[PDB]
Symmetry: D2
Subunit: 474 residues, 4 copies
Amino acid sequence: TKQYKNYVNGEWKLSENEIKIYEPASGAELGSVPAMSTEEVDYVYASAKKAQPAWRALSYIERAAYLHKVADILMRDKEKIGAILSKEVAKGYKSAVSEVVRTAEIINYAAEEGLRMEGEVLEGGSFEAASKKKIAVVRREPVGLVLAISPFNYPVNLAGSKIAPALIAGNVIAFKPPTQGSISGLLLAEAFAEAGLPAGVFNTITGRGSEIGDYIVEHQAVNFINFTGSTGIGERIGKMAGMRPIMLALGGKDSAIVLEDADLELTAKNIIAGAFGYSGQRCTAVKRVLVMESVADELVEKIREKVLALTIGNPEDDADITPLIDTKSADYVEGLINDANDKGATALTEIKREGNLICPILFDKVTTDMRLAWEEPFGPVLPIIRVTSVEEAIEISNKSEYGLQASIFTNDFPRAFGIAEQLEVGTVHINNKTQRGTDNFPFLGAKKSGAGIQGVKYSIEAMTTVKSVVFDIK
Amino acid sequence: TKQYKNYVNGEWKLSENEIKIYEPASGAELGSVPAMSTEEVDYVYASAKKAQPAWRALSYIERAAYLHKVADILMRDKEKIGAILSKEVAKGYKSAVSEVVRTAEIINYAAEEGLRMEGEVLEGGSFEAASKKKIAVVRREPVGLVLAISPFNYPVNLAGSKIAPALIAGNVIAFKPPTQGSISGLLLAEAFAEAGLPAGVFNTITGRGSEIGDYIVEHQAVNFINFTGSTGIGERIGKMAGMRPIMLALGGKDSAIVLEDADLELTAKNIIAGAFGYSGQRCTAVKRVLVMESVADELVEKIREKVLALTIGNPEDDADITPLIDTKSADYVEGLINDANDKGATALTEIKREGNLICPILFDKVTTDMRLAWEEPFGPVLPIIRVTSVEEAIEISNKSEYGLQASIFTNDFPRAFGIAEQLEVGTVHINNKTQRGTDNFPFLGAKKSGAGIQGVKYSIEAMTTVKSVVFDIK
Amino acid sequence: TKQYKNYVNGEWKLSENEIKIYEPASGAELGSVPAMSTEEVDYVYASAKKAQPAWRALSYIERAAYLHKVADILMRDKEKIGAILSKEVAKGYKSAVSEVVRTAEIINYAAEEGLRMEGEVLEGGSFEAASKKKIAVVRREPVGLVLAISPFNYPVNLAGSKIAPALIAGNVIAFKPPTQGSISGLLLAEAFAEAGLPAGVFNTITGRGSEIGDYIVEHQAVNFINFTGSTGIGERIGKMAGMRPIMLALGGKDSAIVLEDADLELTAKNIIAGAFGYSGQRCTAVKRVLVMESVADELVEKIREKVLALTIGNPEDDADITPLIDTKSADYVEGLINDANDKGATALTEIKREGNLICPILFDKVTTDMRLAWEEPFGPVLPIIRVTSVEEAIEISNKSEYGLQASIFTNDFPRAFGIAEQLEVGTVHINNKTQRGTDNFPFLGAKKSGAGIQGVKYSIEAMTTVKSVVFDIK
Amino acid sequence: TKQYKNYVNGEWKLSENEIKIYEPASGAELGSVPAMSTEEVDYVYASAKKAQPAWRALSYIERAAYLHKVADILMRDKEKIGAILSKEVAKGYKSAVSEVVRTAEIINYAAEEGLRMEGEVLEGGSFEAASKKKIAVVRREPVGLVLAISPFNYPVNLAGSKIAPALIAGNVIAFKPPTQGSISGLLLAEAFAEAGLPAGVFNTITGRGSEIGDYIVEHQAVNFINFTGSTGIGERIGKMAGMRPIMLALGGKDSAIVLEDADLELTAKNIIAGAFGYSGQRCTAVKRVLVMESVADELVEKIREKVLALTIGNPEDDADITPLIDTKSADYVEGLINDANDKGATALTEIKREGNLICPILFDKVTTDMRLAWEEPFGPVLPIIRVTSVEEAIEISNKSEYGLQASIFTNDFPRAFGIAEQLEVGTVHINNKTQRGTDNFPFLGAKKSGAGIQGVKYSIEAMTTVKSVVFDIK
Ligand SMILES: NC(=O)c1ccc[n+]([C@@H]2O[C@H](COP(=O)([O-])OP(=O)(O)OC[C@H]3O[C@@H](n4cnc5c(N)ncnc54)[C@H](OP(=O)(O)O)[C@@H]3O)[C@@H](O)[C@H]2O)c1
Ligand SMILES: NC(=O)c1ccc[n+]([C@@H]2O[C@H](COP(=O)([O-])OP(=O)(O)OC[C@H]3O[C@@H](n4cnc5c(N)ncnc54)[C@H](OP(=O)(O)O)[C@@H]3O)[C@@H](O)[C@H]2O)c1
Ligand SMILES: NC(=O)c1ccc[n+]([C@@H]2O[C@H](COP(=O)([O-])OP(=O)(O)OC[C@H]3O[C@@H](n4cnc5c(N)ncnc54)[C@H](OP(=O)(O)O)[C@@H]3O)[C@@H](O)[C@H]2O)c1
């Protein structure tokens, strides 16, 4: 078996036990990753903690130089990395190479954003006359050791987005990728190893989350937990963090609200791209259409037609719709599909599953009584919900426990802004599908979708604290 | 004669000579103000300069308290002050009490904005590794003595908007109101006298600009010149400032661009209010309408009708259209009117002048060959210029030497934003008339409309410099 | 008994049950406060949640006006409130009126800071060329309902510091004061009632934390938990918060690091004031002195002498040392004293307790083996720990689980700055005692001393999130 | 003769007439640069104005890529460029290569600082209730065409420091190097040509300032003048700019204030390095020592001794002291030396001139009556002025018409900060010589030393304006 190793204190280490990884589309063995023991996790953390002071003592520009080197290596190796990633998570080849390119971009951008971090000088005389000579010189400091946890759908990009902002600020890292995506995670580690960051500054941890997951999070060496994944795990992490800071990006059931004055063709095009990209396996995917009754029939017909042009098949063929991550997930999606259909929603597409490959399906006239109106599928199934007012759309949208992003399609901008203000989400996109992008923009979820604000500069701010030095001028 | 005095080094001083001021509407004598000599100007400046160190030595909170007190005195005396102001500049009574209230508002806002001025800490390590222990502690400092010069149309407001931002930062002020408005100016000075700011911190200068103007500006005591007035004087101030910092708020020929999808009734209403407020004697007034041909006839008709609803008459009666500030001004407006008429423009309203009271006029079919298409009238005359494309509208708009603000009336917001990027102006108002409005918002002009950025925090920033203290941490 | 009521949805409500409050110094009964039931807590939250949308819909300026009005009432009532406060928490009368004045100040500052909150515009083109016309318009929004919990040592100030930053931003409040201080907290509520903030916008909750404590925190209506108090409770709150945002201000064991070149008289004076203020019942008190051996004897002598000049007695008599909050507390302190003494520490002052009034004690030759070297007493006892190097002082300082603040006394500033960087605390005061002081300055603790950054603007930032609206310019 | 060409609208152009350039140290011909006609200047400007809209239309990221490319070429050719720069301005070889490296750094830093420029969203509701739904979306825009003028002492570095901040923001450039330094300036142009910036975006102008100088500055195509040079020329530019924005970095006579508690060795080392670097031809050089009488003799001795260790000779030999830029300059410097000597100052070094190579001279006991007390020499001559108090030092320091920077040598930092606040300079360095670096730090002069703030981000802000888009949310 092709045995991958964790990167720990500047060395590559195998564990006594291993986890075999297979390609979700083909079933072919891809290799194995170590199933670390708690003692091995202890050594990672002790290694990072010992390296943190010297890493922090370096100048910002030196830390940036290291990150830029990592990003360069990723650019050079985008085809190598994308080829494996594509197979590991059944993501289209081109899309996987793209994920790597975006990872380098984020890493470069963080290096440069974090190198310009500035402090502030506050005046005691702003608050009290007797303190007019007292000033506070406030500078950012790292929180310490960051634990970064990435999800299967972007095992590399959503690791980089946490890692680089943490590192530029002087924090050290322990990176835990998802098990299905742990090889891609270790391929990312290679870049950090080749770049030559000092030993202990960047480290990886592998093993089943269901077995070492609580241990890595509960560990007292961890000063900050930065996680992307399911709402269920994220809730547990919230509790295990206790009073430690956290960044959580979790599930979504993003609504796309369509008013009577919408450009229906632009709406359908965006809805299709956002709903079906990566077979619906995105947190920010359009996951429910709240369309005013009067334009529904026309919009639905455009969606239906565009759904039929989606290619279906294998990762290597760059199909729009690839097989889902695993059996469990495809099973859960099919149950949601059956529930909708059994309850009487109107399927505009054929219901078909072959292995873990579910064919894209559109359900019209979905009601609040159907599971599919609420649950995040993470499969290529889209419900259309007909509404009779914008007030109803807002109510249905906000009734969700999720609040990541929303899309509003209309030609009435000032009104779209007024509706945005009422939507319990992080980001509202006007006349475009929802998306995390562009990476400098804030990325956050309301309610059960998240805690903390991401996007580059916000991640850096999240993973630093402040040191105030106060003195009197003579 | 009721003889007003200047506030100088905490005392009220008369001069050897005086200028009699008369009410523009009734011709009635209002009072007289001193006609200062160059030596008296010298004394104002030497007093201010002497007081500056101790005024800067106060805490921000102490300066803010003085400022809030001034604002409170203004609120208490709004009727007293607005009554005289109304008579001094032929401004509607209610509008004049309104100018005083806005002055108190700007003053209070500036006090609280300026008290929260923060500095920054920069890292040597952001730029070079060898300087990682070097930091720069950067704090704002006043420029010193500010010369504030207000125009006739807002003698009190456009004085407070310069003074309060100047003073909160620790600068000292020498305020020169316009001659026609100097009494109002001196009434404002009373508020500062009663608030009890230390002697020399705030002072006034009176005399004819055409005689002491160059002297007060060229004086080497002055560290900053903040002026609102004609483009003509503004240009001379630019040259006489030499390398000293300046704030110039000059004229405008604000265009109101009307697209085919505009809401015509809203457009007309905003156009009427913006073009005719204070008989068009505002820098930010809507001064030319660039309207798409297809909707022109309809929009023209609406404006015509609303023009007839405008009241005409005296200040005490709160008429919309009051007599112009002076003969010269009315004579200049009549010249533009005749040039447009004699060139073929269609006057939809009756051309009539009685004394200095000119009746509101709407001119249609104004071409680029007419003076009125370009020159700022400072009178109740509106030109309508029909275009056949947005591109044409943009070209014409930008062909002006002025560039204060523009209005865009459309229901296509993203396009409005795209257009706003191309307009050579400081502020673009979408579906609203142009306006200095909301004093916290930036206020600036491109090309011949200004230098520097106003609006509260921007004024504060303009009238402060920075003092950087660099040292190495051990 | 005088039976106080809670302010709930615009009404003053009593509960079935009540808790009787007694003066700690005299034992006299002060009155009673309600002991709310879980259903009454539910009513408070349901009322707040209902009032929130309309409170948010107001303009910043309107919410600020409400806040200023509250602070005005507090200034008017400072003696009435300080009188009771003094009795309820055995705080010197002048100190008590002072806390109320500081509260009004914090409230006004927050109103004015919060009203000026600004959003940002981010460019897609900063990150990717293809997104050059995409922009993000990011504005702050409230989190919703904030649960504010104040401690006994500043029941009113540490309530206002949470309340106003919360309300200015558009959040609603549920304030729970400490039981011993609940009357004072309810007196604060009177001001909010008189100010006339809409019903449900501001509400109080009373009851023993040990009984409704978890219930109020765990309630799903609460969107943010802002707490000051013990580290033990803070930890539990962190766990009960799950993934909801929190602000925790907990214990401290602030060290005062004295170098050989220190100004011993200045040092001694600051050490006395910080250590003994309010009988050592402040989170930020100087709690351990880490003095270089060579200057120890001289410094210790100066402290010893100054301790003897402290007044001991009742609240009404503005004594420096008042009786401790309760018996339990004084018993805890006495156990620390006995442990130090039994272990070999040299008490330079007499050990004496009468009721709950403990006389100020100076322990010299304290070792790391003594409980007093580590545990926060919250009583008038100061240990002196002699070190032989700055490095040692840094080690011992950082060895603590607390990290609120630190003092450094030296004439070598650049070195003091270098030491500050290494100290695991929020704020380092150079040549001054530690202090939350100047409320505009950031206030935070590292390690077990806290979570989140307080200080006005920081609290506002903490209790708001962002809403990003993204669109493409055409 | 090696004929250099100007880079204009993407082409390399010769002029009818040329200027021959000779090496200041050897007298050897170096090459010739064009002597442009007013018409050729007109073509540069028309070219840039035409290229501007399309350069602005690019994304920030694309403009940054071009700049980064330019920086890359400069690094690649640092020896080639430094070799000629060294010869052209008689700057030591390594120092010349060092100037090129610093230019690449500044270009890269500006590229990345500029790409992250963000806008602001202001709320009408902060100022007035009625305007609660109105917001201002404020974004930076370029000013248009920037005229950049560099000085002989850093013909390349002080070109790049103006050019890159201008270009990243979307401005176009016309670069006029100094005549003595025009070759190096054209070498810099080569890197912009090789980077492939579109035609007209970056252009050069060569000719004698005394002949086309006023022309290039008065030209109405120029939207901003960014100049580093003599105070004499800078004053004329101030006037010629009229109301157009400017950045002026002029002369300095930086004082190094030495207190009784100074570390005399560190003080002498810094004084020697700052005063004699590049033979005193630096705006930020230490130009006058204001030393407390009691430590004077000891400091003076240290300086005297360190002055003798300075190498004197040719550029190619990397001598500390090289020949001055020209005869006129060395003649001027000699006159200042003679005045000081004739007036009775104590020369601690021999007075010696061979060609234009003046040996480093230290004059003690300099009195306010000597020209050398006040005039900026731009030669290797240093006056020591003895004082009896810090107040006297401050008075003598501020009595100068220059106020670029100051140095304070002391072991009492809080006092140094109090002294800094009083010094009329832009930057005060504590226990270090004055210097423009690090380049992210602000760089500005008070009084006759400058107008505007430089240092990377400040340069970017100076050369951009704001476009405000106001609208009402529905
Ligand atoms: N388009 C037009 O024909 C027209 C006509 C009238 C007004 N306006 C407009 O009026 C607004 C300001 O009006 P304004 O007539 O009060 O402007 P202004 O005559 O330029 O004067 C504004 C201020 O500058 C002072 N001043 C005059 N000469 C000066 C000098 N040499 N040096 C220093 N200060 C000097 C004035 O004092 P004195 O009052 O003592 O002169 C007054 O306080 C601008 O928008 C301008 O467009 C335009
Ligand atoms: N060094 C010590 O051992 C010691 C002793 C006391 C205080 N302190 C310090 O003083 C500060 C805290 O003062 P404090 O004694 O007032 O502390 P505290 O008991 O933790 O309580 C602070 C606030 O939290 C409330 N609370 C108590 N239990 C709660 C629960 N389960 N859930 C939610 N809220 C709950 C309290 O209400 P109730 O009043 O109803 O309980 C009070 O309002 C910190 O420095 C701590 O270090 C230290
Ligand atoms: N006080 C003194 O007597 C003295 C003497 C030497 C140096 N300095 C110091 O020298 C530094 C500047 O060096 P520098 O000698 O290169 O200064 P400078 O002669 O003022 O020239 C700086 C730049 O200005 C250009 N220039 C000259 N006349 C101009 C005009 N009318 N309009 C526009 N641009 C014009 C120059 O081109 P050309 O090269 O073709 O003219 C040059 O690139 C400052 O620190 C200054 O204080 C002072």
